[PDB]
Paper text:
FtsZ is an assembling GTPase that plays a key role during bacterial cell division. This widely conserved protein polymerizes in the presence of GTP and metal cations into polar filaments that gather at the center of dividing cells to form a dynamic Z-ring. First, GTP hydrolysis only occurs within the filament, as the complete catalytic site is formed at the interface between adjacent FtsZ monomers. We report a dozen filament structures of the FtsZ core (residues 12 to 316) from the pathogen S. aureus, hereafter SaFtsZ, in complex with various GTP mimetics and metal ions.
Interestingly, mutants Q48A and R143K supported assembly, forming polymers that are stabilized against disassembly by GTP consumption as compared to the wild-type protein. This correlates with reduced GTPase activity by about 6-fold in both mutants. In the structure of the R143K mutant, K143 occupies an equivalent position to that of R143 in the wild-type protein but its positive charge lies 3 Å further from the GDP α- and γ-phosphates. As the R143Q mutant is incompetent for polymerization and catalysis, our results indicate that a positively charged residue in this position is required for GTP hydrolysis. Second, we found that bottom residue R143, which connects to both D213 and the nucleotide γ-phosphate through bridging water B1, contributes to catalysis and that the position of its positive charge is critical for efficient GTP hydrolysis. Accordingly, R143K and not R143Q mutation allows assembly but presents reduced GTPase activity. The role of R143 is likely equivalent to that of the arginine finger in Ras-like GTPases, while in these enzymes, the finger residue contacts the nucleotide directly. The polymers formed by the Q48A and R143K mutants were mostly filamentous ribbons, rather than the bundles observed for the wild-type protein. While the wild-type protein forms rapidly depolymerizing, single and double, wavy filaments, Q48A and R143K form stabilized, straight, thin filaments that slowly evolve into filamentous ribbons.
Numbering used by the authors: 9 to 315
The structure:
Protein backbone atom coordinates (compact mmCIF):
# COMPACT_ATOMS: atom_id res chain seq x y z
CA UNK A 1 0.00 0.00 0.00
CA UNK A 2 1.19 3.48 -1.04
CA UNK A 3 0.34 6.89 0.49
CA UNK A 4 1.39 9.72 -1.81
CA UNK A 5 2.94 12.83 -0.25
CA UNK A 6 1.67 16.02 -1.92
CA UNK A 7 3.33 19.40 -1.48
CA UNK A 8 2.33 22.86 -2.72
CA UNK A 9 5.19 25.35 -3.22
CA UNK A 10 4.57 29.08 -3.62
CA UNK A 11 7.40 30.98 -5.32
CA UNK A 12 7.53 34.75 -5.16
CA UNK A 13 4.82 37.16 -4.12
CA UNK A 14 1.82 35.87 -6.03
CA UNK A 15 2.71 32.26 -5.35
CA UNK A 16 3.07 32.93 -1.65
CA UNK A 17 -0.25 34.84 -1.71
CA UNK A 18 -1.88 31.73 -3.18
CA UNK A 19 -0.34 29.54 -0.47
CA UNK A 20 -1.58 31.81 2.32
CA UNK A 21 -5.12 31.91 0.92
CA UNK A 22 -5.19 28.13 0.45
CA UNK A 23 -4.07 27.53 4.05
CA UNK A 24 -6.77 29.95 5.22
CA UNK A 25 -9.36 28.03 3.21
CA UNK A 26 -8.16 24.79 4.80
CA UNK A 27 -6.18 22.08 3.01
CA UNK A 28 -5.32 18.92 4.95
CA UNK A 29 -2.97 16.06 4.01
CA UNK A 30 -0.99 18.60 1.93
CA UNK A 31 2.26 20.27 2.98
CA UNK A 32 2.97 23.89 2.05
CA UNK A 33 6.36 25.43 1.26
CA UNK A 34 6.90 29.18 0.88
CA UNK A 35 9.91 30.33 -1.20
CA UNK A 36 10.74 34.02 -1.60
CA UNK A 37 13.52 36.60 -1.81
CA UNK A 38 11.32 39.04 0.12
CA UNK A 39 11.95 38.37 3.80
CA UNK A 40 9.18 40.74 4.90
CA UNK A 41 6.59 38.75 2.95
CA UNK A 42 8.11 35.44 4.02
CA UNK A 43 7.70 36.47 7.67
CA UNK A 44 3.95 36.79 7.05
CA UNK A 45 3.66 33.42 5.32
CA UNK A 46 1.42 30.85 6.98
CA UNK A 47 3.44 27.97 5.48
CA UNK A 48 5.07 25.49 7.84
CA UNK A 49 8.22 25.47 5.66
CA UNK A 50 9.80 28.78 4.61
CA UNK A 51 12.90 29.20 2.44
CA UNK A 52 14.44 32.65 2.01
CA UNK A 53 16.50 32.58 -1.19
CA UNK A 54 19.10 35.04 -2.45
CA UNK A 55 19.64 36.90 0.82
CA UNK A 56 23.21 37.69 -0.26
CA UNK A 57 21.86 38.90 -3.62
CA UNK A 58 18.92 41.06 -2.57
CA UNK A 59 19.74 41.77 1.10
CA UNK A 60 16.24 40.49 1.99
CA UNK A 61 14.33 42.51 -0.62
CA UNK A 62 12.46 41.17 -3.60
CA UNK A 63 14.05 40.83 -7.01
CA UNK A 64 12.72 44.19 -8.23
CA UNK A 65 10.95 42.52 -11.21
CA UNK A 66 14.26 41.13 -12.59
CA UNK A 67 14.07 37.36 -13.36
CA UNK A 68 17.84 36.87 -13.47
CA UNK A 69 17.96 37.61 -9.74
CA UNK A 70 15.26 35.05 -8.99
CA UNK A 71 17.01 32.34 -11.01
CA UNK A 72 20.37 32.90 -9.29
CA UNK A 73 18.75 33.06 -5.85
CA UNK A 74 17.04 29.70 -6.39
CA UNK A 75 20.09 27.94 -7.83
CA UNK A 76 22.24 29.00 -4.87
CA UNK A 77 19.63 27.59 -2.47
CA UNK A 78 19.15 24.23 -4.23
CA UNK A 79 20.12 22.13 -1.20
CA UNK A 80 17.69 23.98 1.06
CA UNK A 81 14.93 23.59 -1.53
CA UNK A 82 15.70 19.87 -1.93
CA UNK A 83 15.49 19.38 1.84
CA UNK A 84 12.03 20.96 2.00
CA UNK A 85 10.79 18.81 -0.89
CA UNK A 86 12.29 15.49 0.28
CA UNK A 87 9.60 12.85 0.62
CA UNK A 88 7.25 14.42 -1.93
CA UNK A 89 5.65 12.21 -4.54
CA UNK A 90 3.87 15.15 -6.17
CA UNK A 91 4.79 18.84 -6.10
CA UNK A 92 2.63 21.73 -7.28
CA UNK A 93 4.63 24.90 -7.98
CA UNK A 94 2.59 28.09 -8.08
CA UNK A 95 3.90 31.50 -9.09
CA UNK A 96 2.93 34.70 -10.85
CA UNK A 97 5.01 35.17 -14.00
CA UNK A 98 6.36 38.59 -14.96
CA UNK A 99 8.16 39.62 -11.78
CA UNK A 100 11.70 38.90 -10.77
CA UNK A 101 11.42 36.11 -8.24
CA UNK A 102 8.64 33.92 -9.61
CA UNK A 103 9.70 34.20 -13.26
CA UNK A 104 13.29 33.21 -12.50
CA UNK A 105 13.01 30.95 -9.44
CA UNK A 106 9.86 28.94 -10.14
CA UNK A 107 11.45 27.05 -13.10
CA UNK A 108 14.46 26.21 -10.94
CA UNK A 109 12.22 24.94 -8.14
CA UNK A 110 10.23 22.87 -10.65
CA UNK A 111 13.39 21.31 -12.10
CA UNK A 112 14.66 20.40 -8.62
CA UNK A 113 11.38 18.66 -7.82
CA UNK A 114 11.37 16.82 -11.16
CA UNK A 115 14.93 15.57 -10.69
CA UNK A 116 13.96 14.27 -7.26
CA UNK A 117 11.33 12.18 -9.07
CA UNK A 118 8.22 14.05 -7.94
CA UNK A 119 5.35 14.43 -10.37
CA UNK A 120 5.76 18.16 -10.92
CA UNK A 121 2.81 20.43 -11.82
CA UNK A 122 3.11 24.17 -12.45
CA UNK A 123 0.13 26.51 -12.01
CA UNK A 124 1.20 30.02 -12.98
CA UNK A 125 -0.40 33.33 -13.90
CA UNK A 126 0.40 35.75 -16.76
CA UNK A 127 0.24 39.48 -15.96
CA UNK A 128 -2.66 41.75 -16.78
CA UNK A 129 -2.34 43.58 -20.09
CA UNK A 130 -2.42 46.87 -18.19
CA UNK A 131 0.93 45.89 -16.64
CA UNK A 132 2.53 46.48 -20.06
CA UNK A 133 4.27 44.64 -22.89
CA UNK A 134 7.66 44.25 -21.20
CA UNK A 135 6.16 42.33 -18.30
CA UNK A 136 4.13 40.19 -20.70
CA UNK A 137 7.32 39.38 -22.63
CA UNK A 138 9.18 38.50 -19.41
CA UNK A 139 6.27 36.35 -18.25
CA UNK A 140 6.23 34.57 -21.61
CA UNK A 141 9.88 33.60 -21.17
CA UNK A 142 9.07 32.34 -17.68
CA UNK A 143 6.16 30.25 -18.99
CA UNK A 144 8.43 28.64 -21.58
CA UNK A 145 11.03 27.93 -18.90
CA UNK A 146 8.32 26.43 -16.68
CA UNK A 147 7.13 24.17 -19.49
CA UNK A 148 10.68 22.85 -19.93
CA UNK A 149 10.89 22.06 -16.20
CA UNK A 150 7.49 20.56 -15.23
CA UNK A 151 5.55 17.42 -16.07
CA UNK A 152 2.40 19.48 -16.70
CA UNK A 153 1.66 23.21 -16.77
CA UNK A 154 -1.57 25.16 -16.18
CA UNK A 155 -1.46 28.83 -17.18
CA UNK A 156 -4.01 31.36 -15.93
CA UNK A 157 -3.83 34.68 -17.81
CA UNK A 158 -4.81 37.32 -15.27
CA UNK A 159 -6.71 39.11 -18.04
CA UNK A 160 -9.31 36.33 -17.77
CA UNK A 161 -10.17 37.60 -14.28
CA UNK A 162 -11.64 40.68 -15.99
CA UNK A 163 -14.11 38.32 -17.68
CA UNK A 164 -15.55 37.01 -14.38
CA UNK A 165 -15.90 40.19 -12.27
CA UNK A 166 -18.54 42.87 -12.25
CA UNK A 167 -17.60 46.51 -11.67
CA UNK A 168 -17.55 46.00 -7.89
CA UNK A 169 -16.02 42.54 -7.35
CA UNK A 170 -13.14 42.96 -4.86
CA UNK A 171 -9.73 42.17 -6.31
CA UNK A 172 -9.17 39.63 -3.52
CA UNK A 173 -12.37 37.81 -4.47
CA UNK A 174 -11.17 37.63 -8.08
CA UNK A 175 -7.79 36.31 -6.90
CA UNK A 176 -9.58 33.56 -4.96
CA UNK A 177 -11.25 32.45 -8.21
CA UNK A 178 -7.81 31.94 -9.73
CA UNK A 179 -6.67 30.14 -6.53
CA UNK A 180 -9.51 27.65 -6.95
CA UNK A 181 -7.87 26.19 -10.07
CA UNK A 182 -4.89 24.95 -8.07
CA UNK A 183 -6.74 24.30 -4.82
CA UNK A 184 -9.54 22.21 -6.32
CA UNK A 185 -7.03 20.35 -8.51
CA UNK A 186 -4.89 19.38 -5.51
CA UNK A 187 -7.99 18.42 -3.53
CA UNK A 188 -9.37 16.30 -6.34
CA UNK A 189 -6.09 14.41 -6.62
CA UNK A 190 -5.82 14.08 -2.84
CA UNK A 191 -9.35 12.63 -2.73
CA UNK A 192 -8.56 10.25 -5.59
CA UNK A 193 -5.51 8.88 -3.74
CA UNK A 194 -7.30 8.53 -0.40
CA UNK A 195 -10.47 6.68 -1.47
CA UNK A 196 -10.54 3.25 -3.02
CA UNK A 197 -12.91 3.53 -5.95
CA UNK A 198 -15.33 0.94 -7.25
CA UNK A 199 -13.55 1.45 -10.55
CA UNK A 200 -10.33 2.41 -8.81
CA UNK A 201 -7.84 5.05 -9.89
CA UNK A 202 -4.71 5.65 -7.86
CA UNK A 203 -1.54 7.77 -7.93
CA UNK A 204 -0.06 5.62 -10.73
CA UNK A 205 -3.00 6.71 -12.91
CA UNK A 206 -2.32 10.34 -12.06
CA UNK A 207 1.28 9.78 -13.19
CA UNK A 208 0.10 8.19 -16.45
CA UNK A 209 -2.00 11.20 -17.37
CA UNK A 210 0.40 13.90 -16.14
CA UNK A 211 4.02 12.72 -16.53
CA UNK A 212 6.00 14.50 -19.29
CA UNK A 213 2.90 15.95 -20.96
CA UNK A 214 3.08 19.76 -21.23
CA UNK A 215 -0.13 21.79 -21.14
CA UNK A 216 -2.88 20.54 -18.86
CA UNK A 217 -6.43 21.21 -17.71
CA UNK A 218 -7.61 20.33 -14.19
CA UNK A 219 -11.27 20.86 -13.34
CA UNK A 220 -14.04 19.74 -11.02
CA UNK A 221 -17.81 19.93 -11.42
CA UNK A 222 -20.58 19.34 -8.89
CA UNK A 223 -24.28 19.09 -9.69
CA UNK A 224 -27.52 17.60 -8.40
CA UNK A 225 -30.88 16.64 -9.77
CA UNK A 226 -31.94 15.99 -13.33
CA UNK A 227 -29.10 15.86 -15.88
CA UNK A 228 -26.60 16.11 -13.01
CA UNK A 229 -23.91 14.06 -14.78
CA UNK A 230 -23.92 16.17 -17.95
CA UNK A 231 -24.03 19.39 -15.94
CA UNK A 232 -21.19 18.31 -13.63
CA UNK A 233 -19.05 17.19 -16.59
CA UNK A 234 -19.62 20.50 -18.38
CA UNK A 235 -18.62 22.41 -15.22
CA UNK A 236 -15.44 20.34 -14.95
CA UNK A 237 -14.12 21.33 -18.40
CA UNK A 238 -15.40 24.87 -18.92
CA UNK A 239 -13.43 27.34 -16.79
CA UNK A 240 -13.16 30.84 -18.31
CA UNK A 241 -9.77 31.37 -16.57
CA UNK A 242 -7.66 28.89 -18.49
CA UNK A 243 -5.25 29.37 -21.35
CA UNK A 244 -5.52 25.67 -22.24
CA UNK A 245 -9.13 24.64 -22.79
CA UNK A 246 -10.36 21.06 -23.17
CA UNK A 247 -10.27 21.35 -26.99
CA UNK A 248 -7.56 19.10 -28.44
CA UNK A 249 -7.04 16.89 -25.38
CA UNK A 250 -5.97 13.36 -26.24
CA UNK A 251 -5.64 11.96 -22.71
CA UNK A 252 -8.16 12.44 -19.90
CA UNK A 253 -8.35 11.16 -16.35
CA UNK A 254 -12.01 11.36 -15.33
CA UNK A 255 -13.36 10.26 -11.97
CA UNK A 256 -17.07 10.29 -11.09
CA UNK A 257 -18.12 10.28 -7.43
CA UNK A 258 -21.73 9.71 -6.46
CA UNK A 259 -24.06 7.97 -4.06
CA UNK A 260 -25.54 4.52 -4.52
CA UNK A 261 -27.84 5.90 -7.24
CA UNK A 262 -24.92 6.60 -9.64
CA UNK A 263 -26.13 5.10 -12.91
CA UNK A 264 -24.10 3.52 -15.71
CA UNK A 265 -26.10 5.58 -18.24
CA UNK A 266 -25.13 8.87 -16.60
CA UNK A 267 -21.47 7.84 -16.33
CA UNK A 268 -21.44 7.29 -20.10
CA UNK A 269 -23.19 10.64 -20.58
CA UNK A 270 -20.45 12.40 -18.63
CA UNK A 271 -17.65 10.59 -20.47
CA UNK A 272 -19.31 11.50 -23.78
CA UNK A 273 -19.44 15.20 -22.81
CA UNK A 274 -15.67 15.17 -22.28
CA UNK A 275 -14.89 13.16 -25.43
CA UNK A 276 -17.08 15.42 -27.58
CA UNK A 277 -15.64 18.62 -26.13
CA UNK A 278 -12.05 17.50 -26.70
CA UNK A 279 -12.97 16.91 -30.36
CA UNK A 280 -10.38 14.09 -30.39
CA UNK A 281 -10.22 10.37 -29.75
CA UNK A 282 -9.37 10.61 -26.07
CA UNK A 283 -7.48 7.94 -24.16
CA UNK A 284 -9.67 8.03 -21.06
CA UNK A 285 -8.60 6.67 -17.70
CA UNK A 286 -12.01 6.28 -16.08
CA UNK A 287 -12.82 5.93 -12.39
CA UNK A 288 -15.90 5.73 -10.19
CA UNK A 289 -16.32 6.19 -6.43
CA UNK A 290 -19.53 5.36 -4.58
CA UNK A 291 -19.83 7.65 -1.55
CA UNK A 292 -23.03 6.62 0.27
CA UNK A 293 -23.04 9.90 2.22
CA UNK A 294 -23.83 11.65 -1.06
CA UNK A 295 -27.53 11.53 -1.81
CA UNK A 296 -28.34 13.32 -5.08
CA UNK A 297 -24.94 14.99 -5.63
CA UNK A 298 -22.46 13.94 -8.32
CA UNK A 299 -18.83 15.06 -8.57
CA UNK A 300 -16.86 14.90 -11.82
CA UNK A 301 -13.06 15.33 -11.71
CA UNK A 302 -11.15 15.88 -14.97
CA UNK A 303 -7.43 16.02 -15.71
CA UNK A 304 -6.76 16.53 -19.43
CA UNK A 305 -3.39 16.39 -21.23
CA UNK A 306 -1.98 15.28 -24.58
CA UNK A 307 -2.32 18.60 -26.40
N1 LIG B 1 -3.80 36.13 -9.83
C1 LIG B 1 -2.84 36.72 -9.06
N2 LIG B 1 -1.80 37.34 -9.66
C2 LIG B 1 -0.83 37.92 -8.91
C3 LIG B 1 -0.90 37.90 -7.45
N3 LIG B 1 0.18 38.53 -6.97
C4 LIG B 1 0.89 38.95 -8.05
N4 LIG B 1 0.26 38.60 -9.19
C5 LIG B 1 0.73 38.72 -10.58
O1 LIG B 1 2.05 38.10 -10.55
C6 LIG B 1 2.99 38.97 -11.17
C7 LIG B 1 4.35 38.89 -10.44
O2 LIG B 1 4.22 39.46 -9.13
P1 LIG B 1 4.95 38.83 -7.85
O3 LIG B 1 4.63 37.35 -7.74
O4 LIG B 1 4.58 39.64 -6.64
O5 LIG B 1 6.45 39.10 -8.34
P2 LIG B 1 7.77 38.36 -7.73
O6 LIG B 1 7.61 38.13 -6.26
O7 LIG B 1 8.93 39.23 -8.06
O8 LIG B 1 7.89 37.03 -8.43
C8 LIG B 1 2.36 40.35 -11.11
O9 LIG B 1 2.81 41.12 -12.21
C9 LIG B 1 0.88 40.06 -11.24
O10 LIG B 1 0.57 39.77 -12.61
C10 LIG B 1 -2.04 37.20 -6.88
O11 LIG B 1 -2.15 37.13 -5.64
N5 LIG B 1 -2.94 36.65 -7.72
K1 LIG C 1 -7.36 5.08 -4.78
Amino acid sequence: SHMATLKVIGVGGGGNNAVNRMIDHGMNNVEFIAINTDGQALNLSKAESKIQIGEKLTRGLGAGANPEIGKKAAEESREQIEDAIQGADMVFVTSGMGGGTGTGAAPVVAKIAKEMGALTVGVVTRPFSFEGRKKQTQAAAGVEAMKAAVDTLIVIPNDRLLDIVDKSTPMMEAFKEADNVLRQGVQGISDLIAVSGEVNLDFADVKTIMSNQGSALMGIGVSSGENRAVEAAKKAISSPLLETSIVGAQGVLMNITGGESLSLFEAQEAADIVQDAADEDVNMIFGTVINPELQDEIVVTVIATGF
